[PDB]
Design a protein around this nucleic acid. Structure first.
Lengths: 49, 58, 902, 839, 126
RNA sequence: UUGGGCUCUGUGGGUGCUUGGCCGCUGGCCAGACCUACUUCAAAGCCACCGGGGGUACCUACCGGUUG
């Protein structure tokens, strides 16, 4: 039996996918890829009380 | 006894779930001590089955 | 010559000709053997088995007529000038020719034999002896013996030196004389006359391990041993029969091995090229014989096709070893035994090639994608009635594929003694073989010993059964083989008609061997069973489809649904495999007579050899001929495929091999050989070709010059919106080229010292990269805009690396304030030019994108280029509207077609 | 379909223990994995490998400075050279001694090689590519010279610029200076005096001063100077330095005499680079925790290359900007699963190491890892829309990543703590299932809620295999209950159904034509069942058809080797014609799913470092000490971090201890390229990618006698019969010919061509025009071609949808590639310039 | 040694033993003839795999059969499964593997339960 | 088919792609031979695997001192 399931966070940044990526000269991604910031509009702002 | 057991495992007759066994120190957890059994078709299996008269060559 | 295949090697050969070997001891642990192919020489190891150490390159243009190997070099004399052939002598070292020997121009004689000693080499031609100083490799003199008679002046037998005599040669005449000449002065010093002069010629001569005693072998029969300065005869021996002269002789220097005690020395081995036997004498008391070795090879005979003899004997340095090379492509090294006495030696090493030409030739398919592979093993069916598995990789690991304890069978009988002979005991010769390693599981195939061709299934069907079928000459029974076990299996198959077998092939899956007779019937046997299951036909109109003639050319589809079967005269019938029944046939009876076929899967393609010297190629599914070819001038000897369906090679009676390009349906090649090539064979992937000539046993190996270098050979003889060529990686990184350097910037930085060395010495082409194609992009763009063609600067930016490209695209400037000095405006007009050119939409829009991305303040500040943006915007809106409607139509109905039921 | 599969390119690794090299240009990267070598092109993202092989692991490679010729060197002697642009074998050759050093000359005429003691220079034979009238020699390698003035292994070699002299680094604390011939002002001399062995000597550009770096981190610049008492000059030491790398000893050092820089690579995973003749530290950096195996440099000098043996760890590193070029992590475990996206330009693998990594099929390179999974990672799976992957591991927790923004946006544990061993997902991406060895009930979760939908059950034991039906309705589980369980789930009233087996279950797979389902059972049999009428359409054995054995440490013949007769996994072809299977065994089978025969069998390795890969082994290497590879050569080293044996006794699966020498072959899985025409097996050595070689083999469709390339060109130019020319071009199926005629037809007759084009030949044409869309610079040509095709055969393709499905999908990938590549930028730029003219 | 295979046959609580050894074609259940053993209307159902195989497969063998336990339908079913599994195993151990695959493909192609003890199980709708 | 079988032992090959036996090797030898010279300068540190809890009289080591 593996472990106790522990609560754990991982703080993301707002960088692109190809910024999060490992080290290559040129990504497999094209040009429509390479701009999304790892966080949705819900993330970048939530209207709330 | 552990002579028959160890020699048996050296010539490889004991599957463990799906894999075979070569290396007679495969530690066996309490969960696995049920799924130990004999391999795909060996003559040890057929010793068992030739004795209890369910020997069916198929 | 040819344009595709270059000559590489002739194999199947260790020593077939008449030239004897030469043998040197290396150190105190190995012995080099050196033997002539006939167009080369190989050197074998003795201690390390009998593998091949050196192969002599380049090939002599003519048949070698003499050789000897010194401490390092191989001296080989080639060429009988009496019939056309140019002659010479070459000096090789480690298989490669280092030097050449200067012949006298007045040599119209083939050069018989070679001897080396001191600082001199001597070479005996026919009656003439030439000398070179070996320390300089220079011609010194030429010895000319004289006799009163045209016959008696002939230098038969040979010549030798004594070990303790300074510069003295001992030659045998055609008369019974031996002449001693001093080579330093080139003077005949002495001669010795044969006692009892009824003996005619010195057929051989050899110094003994004692001092100053020569043994002379006479064609009249006597073996004599004599003092050579006293002229004192030590012993006569009546050993040569009149028409059965001895060939040569050797003494045992190993120190013991005579007198029946093991406690005595002085043993002579002798042999005659009329026999296959050799002979052993204890020389001490009466020069007694003690032991006959009977049939150490096949003896030569003119009534039979068998070729053989004994070209030499040798005792090596001081050990129980004796080599005999015969003419039966044959070496067997023998060994004296110590713990008992024995008359004869037993064998201890062997290498063999055939005693007759090769009939059939075949390759082995790949260990399905492994290493045993395409080009390793080639099966050869020799007219010596045998089957050999030849190794292209290391010729030693070739072997016979025996038929049992056959030699012991002969020895229990009298085939080795004095009825038939051994080729007549082994199975008859080989019509046609087929192999399939789709079950050939190697040494473990059937554990134990198994009977042979008999005329139990758990263990068998677990691992592996036989895998090679062979059709033989006049048997009604065809034969199986355990390939991976190197022996005949247990299974022979008749025809049922009883007529002798015509041809045989096997399933795609190693399961059923199928044989077609010369009677017409087609039969099928399961190997694991060795059981008949299907005759064609069994019992269109069913039950009546039997071939009216001989049946050559039988193969199966690999799916084993339809089996195609050609009658020699008439038609080709296609049969439902499972039903054994004739489905579909095609007849060319009144005009052709089909004499064979080969079938390549991977293409569903079959070539047919038909007796009007033609080849008809059919695609099997569409059941109609697709590719007929008429190039031959004799009957078709043998033909084979390409791995790829691109080439067909064919050999005919006239020693002319023609090659056709199948896709172009054309002639490529045609080339003539010195001999007619009987059989054709092609490696199971396209690297090698092996061809079987007539007469010359040991097949030929060619390479694929096309597989290496491209040949343009096509000589049929008789005797709108487009993209670019730029890396998609390159333009995408030009758009994305900041974030790549973010992801390639290390997480933890490199830790430079606080004492930073300023002015590192630069790298590359003067500080910047090699990736910039070498010879001012602003000058290029400005002179293109002074002109109208921006295309030079356009191709420059095209050929740019991405870093320099981004540098340049940030490096623009308006400049002085003129419309002829603003690289931005020139850039936009180059883009509009490329857009109306309709050439590089992608790179155009990408450079526009990044330009807009990093020059926006200046372009919303300036309007002189806003005009150009508006015009280019019109052009781009047209192109975008057209292409967008197009690609969206396409992708949308693509989705609608991929998921319509919604 | 047509099955003539050939060995296409390699992937699954980046590197192995062995010599790394650069093309003399600076774009092509030469890397050894095992035996087979791959090249990575660094400007266009390209990569491939060479069709040669070697029986052992690669120890050293050499290349001509001209470029075209490569000489690969495995250990234990044997070697092969090859022409690098025309990637073919040229020559094979046998050394009979273990190499230790290698250096091609800049002459392009010689190379110096070192067997452990003897040192040999050999000339380079000519090539048929480089001589016009010339061919292969028979025994082409010619010995030039050889010297044995030495005492130990010969570590490194370095030629001079002039190709007149070279320095050799020993192991007996010496370096040796030699001339190719007899010079006049030369002695064949020796550099003496050290503490821990000359690992590398080097000339300068000016052949005046030289360097020796030694394993204890000690550099020595030597000069040909007089003896200190004043014709009488000695090559003697003029100055020395140390690297104060405190608690390690370096292993590999290179030095650019052109720009005079020296790089040094160490045992503690941190290298240092230096401006050498003044000995000034450029900097240092830890590339890894483990150590450095081999270091090299660019020819221009701008790039540094490092291959670390133990973890994958190949990295090229731009020092002047202090950034990488590429930094690649390769498996130190067994690749438990592999899958292409439905896009099929990328494969995600998951090994038992913890790392999972998405690589692209193009370029052969890894774009990303996820590494939050704290145990060995078992299987993964994709959706229909492919933008999300699901991973299950041995940490006891499932995680789901969206594959456009790359985060674990779903995390399950099962509550009563399980340990996952097989997983799967709905094709629509709605519910995950996972099946275990802890609690044999099978578990279903829903991707939106994320909380436990339901335990299913009906299983005497753990569920060994999991597969879903691509419609979205039917599940299959397979388990050592001796059951195959078809799970009728997404109606209202759920049910089970047994297929009882005579045996036990190891894997299940599907037909996209979802009527057919197949089972691999451990007795070897494979079975296809009709899925509604839950009944056996066929069964066949596979024991002898994969019986490849004699793994080491076994006293059986490869006759009776159990557990090399189990098909680990199966897969139908993209059309659904050929079942592909592969297991714990030397071989992989490929069968027709109509009349049940072996269409094609293929080897998973040729290599012989690894263990049980050639079904018989021999009486030479069997000693009386047991089998000879087994006497512990982890006991003989100088590296203390080799001499340590941190193994526990006998655990057949994963740990840091890593007995990990002679691993067996287990062929850990296979996956078809969903674009078809290519597949790849994932195996302990790597990931072997076979394709469909349809280029170098002639194969017509249904030809006539009078159909010749000349006749096609005749009816092309003179007759201009475009439809007939096209159909005979297809009927021949010659690549350049069909390309030529396709370019030849103008863009207006396309409508009549497709209007009277035959539906027998349409689908292969769709594949070909998709290929043209992929590979040709003629977009609008191809796109109008497609528009005409869909205008004509919209109804017919909608009628079939299944004999044409893979071709439809490759049309989909063509149009989607063009779309997401170009039209996004088109709209973006027109909007950009529109607002900029609005100011 | 002597050609002998021995094969069971399974039902709820029928079970049958059959011994396939070389012969010329005799077939007996418990020692009495096959045309005598059944409720005679199911005799065709027992005859079935004979009628798919063709008798010449059965030409070279001789089978003893034991049955025991259970009622009539149970018994006849046990006899047929013993017949099938026995003739397949006899071909397995003593003639071509391709012929074993032939009988198995044909017979299974007809009816599934002639080779598998698919047990009546207890999984209703839960 | 003018005897044959089981069983065991012995030899060689091959069970992997065909470049020498040796040495103090740009050379020499295999019958070998020559045999004891010459000399400017010790070394840079670090690491270094013992089963756990427990005691320390004596020994070792480390640290910090002390007389000389």
């Amino acid at each position: 039996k593996p472990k106790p399931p522990a609560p754990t966070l991982t703080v993301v940044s707002d960088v692109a996918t190809v910024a999060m990526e490992d080290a290559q000269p040129a990504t497999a991604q094209g040009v429509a890829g390479g701009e999304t910031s790892m966080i949705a509009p819900q993330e970048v702002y939530a209207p709330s009380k | 006894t552990v002579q028959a057991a160890t020699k048996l495992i050296e010539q490889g007759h004991v599957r463990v779930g799906v894999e075979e066994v070569r290396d007679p120190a495969f530690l066996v957890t309490r969960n696995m001590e049920d799924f130990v059994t004999w391999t795909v078709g060996s003559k040890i299996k057929q010793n068992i089955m030739k004795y209890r008269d369910k020997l069916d060559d198929f | 010559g040819s344009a595709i295949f270059a000559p590489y090697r002739t194999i199947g050969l260790i020593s077939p000709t008449g030239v004897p070997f030469t043998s040197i001891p290396l150190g105190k642990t190995t012995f080099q053997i050196t033997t002539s192919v006939g167009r080369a020489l190989q050197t074998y190891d003795l201690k390390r088995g009998l593998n091949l150490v050196f192969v002599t390159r380049p090939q002599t243009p003519s048949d070698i007529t003499a050789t000897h190997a010194w401490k390092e070099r191989v001296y080989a004399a080639f060429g009988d000038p009496r019939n056309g052939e140019p002659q010479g002598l070459w000096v090789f070292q480690r298989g490669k020719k280092v030097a050449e020997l200067p012949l006298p121009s007045d040599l119209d004689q083939p050069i018989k034999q070679i001897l080396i000693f001191g600082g001199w080499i001597v070479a005996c031609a026919l009656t003439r002896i030439e000398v070179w100083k070996a320390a300089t490799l220079e011609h010194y003199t030429t010895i000319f013996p004289a006799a009163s008679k045209k016959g008696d002046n002939e230098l038969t037998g040979g010549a030798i030196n004594m070990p303790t005599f300074l510069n003295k040669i001992f030659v045998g005449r055609k008369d019974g004389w031996v002449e001693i000449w001093n080579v330093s002065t080139g003077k005949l010093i002495y001669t010795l006359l044969p006692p009892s002069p009824d003996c005619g010629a010195v057929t051989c001569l050899q110094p003994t391990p004692a001092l100053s005693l020569l043994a002379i072998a006479y064609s009249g029969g006597p073996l004599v041993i004599q003092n050579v300065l006293t002229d004192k005869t030590v012993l006569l021996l009546e050993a040569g029969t009149d028409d059965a002269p001895v060939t040569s002789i050797s003494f045992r220097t190993d120190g013991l091995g005579a007198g029946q005690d093991g406690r005595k020395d002085g043993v002579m081995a002798t042999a005659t090229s009329v026999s296959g036997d050799v002979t052993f004498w204890d020389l001490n008391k009466g020069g007694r014989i003690m032991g006959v070795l009977r049939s150490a090879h096949n003896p030569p005979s003119r009534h039979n096709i068998v070729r053989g003899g004994i070209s030499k004997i040798e005792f090596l340095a001081g050990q129980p070893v004796i080599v005999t090379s015969g003419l039966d492509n044959s070496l067997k090294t023998w060994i004296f035994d110590e713990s008992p006495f024995s008359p004869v030696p037993r064998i201890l090493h062997q290498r063999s090639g055939h005693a007759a030409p090769v009939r059939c030739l075949h390759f082995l398919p790949s260990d399905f994608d492994g290493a045993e592979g395409g080009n390793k093993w080639l099966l050869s069916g020799g007219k010596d009635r045998s089957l050999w598995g030849w190794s292209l990789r290391r010729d030693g690991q070739s072997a016979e594929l025996s038929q049992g304890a056959i030699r012991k069978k002969a020895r229990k009988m009298g085939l080795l003694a004095g009825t038939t002979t051994l080729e007549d005991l082994k199975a008859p010769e080989i019509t046609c073989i087929a192999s399939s390693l789709n079950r050939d599981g190697g040494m473990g195939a059937i554990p134990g010993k198994q009977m042979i061709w008999d005329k139990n299934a758990e263990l068998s069907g677990n691992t592996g059964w036989e895998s090679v079928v062979t059709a033989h000459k006049d048997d009604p029974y065809a034969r199986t083989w355990f390939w991976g076990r190197r022996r005949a299996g247990r299974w022979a198959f008749k025809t049922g008609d009883g007529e002798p077998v015509s041809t045989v092939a096997i399933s795609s899956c190693g399961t059923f061997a199928l044989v077609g007779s010369t009677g017409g019937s087609i039969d099928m046997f399961n190997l694991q069973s060795g059981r008949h299951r299907q005759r064609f036909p069994s019992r269109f109109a069913p039950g009546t489809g039997r071939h009216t003639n001989a049946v050559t050319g039988i193969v199966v589809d690999p799916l084993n649904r339809h089996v195609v079967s050609c009658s020699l005269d008439g038609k080709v019938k296609f049969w439902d495999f499972i039903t054994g029944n004739l489905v579909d046939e095609i007849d060319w009876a009144p005009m052709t007579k089909i004499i064979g076929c080969r079938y390549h899967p991977g293409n569903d393609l079959i070539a047919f050899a038909c007796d009007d010297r033609s080849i008809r190629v059919v695609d099997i599914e569409t059941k109609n001929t697709i590719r007929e070819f008429w190039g031959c001038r004799g009957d078709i000897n043998d033909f084979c495929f390409s791995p790829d369906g691109r080439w067909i090679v064919a050999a005919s009676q006239d020693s002319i091999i023609r090659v056709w390009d199948l896709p172009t349906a054309h002639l490529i090649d045609a080339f003539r050989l010195e001999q007619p090539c009987t059989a054709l064979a092609f490696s199971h992937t396209g690297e090698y070709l092996a061809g079987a000539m007539e007469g010359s046993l040991g097949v030929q190996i060619w390479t694929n010059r096309t597989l290496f270098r491209h040949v343009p050979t096509r000589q049929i003889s008789e005797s709108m919106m487009t993209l670019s060529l730029v890396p998609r990686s390159r333009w995408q990184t030009l758009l994305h080229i900041d974030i790549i350097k973010a992801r390639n910037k290390p997480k933890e930085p490199p830790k430079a010292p606080e004492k930073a060395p300023f002015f590192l010495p630069p790298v590359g082409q003067n500080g910047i990269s090699s990736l910039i194609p070498q010879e001012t992009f602003t000058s290029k763009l400005l002179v293109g805009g002074a002109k109208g063609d921006y295309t030079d600067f356009i191709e420059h930016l095209k050929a740019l690396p991405p870093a320099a490209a981004d540098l340049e695209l940030r490096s623009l400037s308006i400049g002085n304030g003129d419309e002829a000095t603003n690289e931005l405006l020139h850039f936009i007009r180059a883009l509009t030019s490329r857009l109306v050119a309709r050439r590089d939409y992608e790179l155009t829009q990408a450079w526009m994108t990044v330009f807009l991305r990093l020059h926006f303040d200046l372009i919303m500040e300036n309007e002189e280029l806003l005009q150009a943006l508006g015009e280019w915007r019109e052009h781009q809106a047209r192109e975008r509207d057209r292409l967008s409607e197009l690609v969206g139509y396409c992708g949308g109905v693509v989705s609608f077609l991929r998921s319509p039921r919604t | 379909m047509k099955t003539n599969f050939k060995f296409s390119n390699l992937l699954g690794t980046v590197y192995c223990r062995g010599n790394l090299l650069f093309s003399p240009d600076g774009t092509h990267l030469f890397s050894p994995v095992g035996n087979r070598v791959t090249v990575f092109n660094l400007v266009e993202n390209k990569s491939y490998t060479f069709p040669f092989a070697h029986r052992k692991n690669i120890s050293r490679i050499g290349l001509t400075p001209q470029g075209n010729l490569l000489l690969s060197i495995d250990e234990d002697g044997q070697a092969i050279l090859t022409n690098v642009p025309r990637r073919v074998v040229l020559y094979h050759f046998s050394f009979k001694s273990p190499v230790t050093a290698l250096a091609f000359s800049p002459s392009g005429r010689h190379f110096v090689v070192g067997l452990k003691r003897k040192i040999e220079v050999w000339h380079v034979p000519s090539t048929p590519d480089t001589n016009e009238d010339g061919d292969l020699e028979f025994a082409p390698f010619v010995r030039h010279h050889t010297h044995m003035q030495h005492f130990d292994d010969v570590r490194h070699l370095e030629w001079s610029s002039d190709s007149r002299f070279f320095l050799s680094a020993s192991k007996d604390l010496t370096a040796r200076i030699w001339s190719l011939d007899t010079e006049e002002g030369f002695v064949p001399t020796v550099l003496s005096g050290h503490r821990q062995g000359v690992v590398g000597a080097y000339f300068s550009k000016d052949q005046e001063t030289i360097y020796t770096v030694s394993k204890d981190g000690a550099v020595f610049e030597w000069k040909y100077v007089a003896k200190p008492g004043h014709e009488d000059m000695q090559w003697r030491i003029v100055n020395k330095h140390f690297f104060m790398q405190n608690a390690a000893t370096l292993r590999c050092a290179a030095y650019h005499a052109e720009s005079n820089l020296l790089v040094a690579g160490f045992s503690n995973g941190i290298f240092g680079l230096y401006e050498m003749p003044d000995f000034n530290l450029i900097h240092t950096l830890s590339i890894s925790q483990n150590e450095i195996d081999f270091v090299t440099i660019n020819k221009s000098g701008e790039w540094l290359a490092f291959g670390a043996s133990k973890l994958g760890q190949l990295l090229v590193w731009e020092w002047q900007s202090e950034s990488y070029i590429l930094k690649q992590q390769g498996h130190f475990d067994a690749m438990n699963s592999l899958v292409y996206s439905p896009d099929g330009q990328r494969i995600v693998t998951a090994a038992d190491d913890g790392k999972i990594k998405v690589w692209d099929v193009e370029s052969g390179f890894c774009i990303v890892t996820f590494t939050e999974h704290t145990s060995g990672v078992t299987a993964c799976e994709f959706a229909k829309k492919g933008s999300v992957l699901f991973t299950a591991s041995l940490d006891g927790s499932v995680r789901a990543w969206d594959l456009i923004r790359y985060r674990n946006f779903r995390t399950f544990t099962a509550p009563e703590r399980l340990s996952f061993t097989c997983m799967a997902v709905d094709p629509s991406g709605e519910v995950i299932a996972a099946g275990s060895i802890d609690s044999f009930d099978i578990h279903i979760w829903s991707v939106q809620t994320g909380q436990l939908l339901d335990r299913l059950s009906g299983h005497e034991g753990p569920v060994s295999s999991l597969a879903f039906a691509p419609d979205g309705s039917v599940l299959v589980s397979g388990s050592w209950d001796r059951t195959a369980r078809i799970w009728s789930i997404f109606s209202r009233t759920q049910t089970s159904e047994p297929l009882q087996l005579q045996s036990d279950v190891l894997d299940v797979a599907f037909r996209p034509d979802s009527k057919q389902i197949a089972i691999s059972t451990l007795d070897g049999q494979l079975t296809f069942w009709s899925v509604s009428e839950a009944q056996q359409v066929s069964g066949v054995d596979g024991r002898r058809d994969v019986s490849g054995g004699r793994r080491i440490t076994d006293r059986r013949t490869a006759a009776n080797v159990a557990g090399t007769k189990n098909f680990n996994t199966i897969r139908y072809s993209m059309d659904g014609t050929c079942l592909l299977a592969g297991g714990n065994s030397k071989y992989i089978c490929l069968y027709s799913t109509t009349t049940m025969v072996l269409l094609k069998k293929f080897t998973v390795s040729v290599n012989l470092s690894l263990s049980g890969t050639q079904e018989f082994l021999n009486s030479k290497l069997m000693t009386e000490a047991g089998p000879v590879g087994l006497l512990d050569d982890q006991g003989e080293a100088s590296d203390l971090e080799d001499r340590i044996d941190r193994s526990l006794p006998g655990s057949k699966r994963g740990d840091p201890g890593a007995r990990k020498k002679f691993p067996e072959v287990r062929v850990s899985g296979v996956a078809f390229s969903p674009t078809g025409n290519s597949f790849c097996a994932a195996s302990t050595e790597g990931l072997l990618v076979y394709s469909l070689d349809n280029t170098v083999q002639f194969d017509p469709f249904d030809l006539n006698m009078e159909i010749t390339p000349a006749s096609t060109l005749a009816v092309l130019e003179k007759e201009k019969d475009y439809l007939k020319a096209l159909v005979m071009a297809f009927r021949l199926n010659e690549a350049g010919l069909i390309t030529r005629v396709y370019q030849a037809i103008p863009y207006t007759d396309i409508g009549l061509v497709v209007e009277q084009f035959p539906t027998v030949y349409v689908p292969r044409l769709l594949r070909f025009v998709a290929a043209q869309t992929e590979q040709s610079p003629h977009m609008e040509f191809c796109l109008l071609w497609i528009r005409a095709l869909i205008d004509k055969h919209g109804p017919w393709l909608a009628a079939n949808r299944g004999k044409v499905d893979v071709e439809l999908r490759v049309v989909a990938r063509a149009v989607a590639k063009m779309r997401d590549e170009i039209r996004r930028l088109a709209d973006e730029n027109v909007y950009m310039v529109d607002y900029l003219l609005n100011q | 040694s002597v050609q002998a295979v021995q094969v069971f046959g399974k039902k709820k609580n029928a079970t049958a033993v059959a011994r396939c050894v070389q012969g010329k074609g005799l077939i007996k259940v418990n020692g009495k003839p096959l045309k005598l053993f059944a409720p005679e209307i199911l005799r065709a159902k027992l005859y079935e795999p004979i009628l798919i195989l063709g008798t010449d497969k059965f030409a070279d063998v001789d089978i003893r059969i034991r049955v025991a336990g259970g009622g009539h339908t149970s018994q006849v079913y046990a006899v047929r499964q013993a017949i099938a599994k026995s003739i397949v195993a006899y071909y397995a151990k003593y003639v071509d593997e391709h012929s074993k695959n032939l009988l198995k493909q044909e017979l299974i192609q007809f009816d599934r339960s002639l080779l598998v003890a698919d047990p009546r199980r207890c999984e209703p709708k839960k």
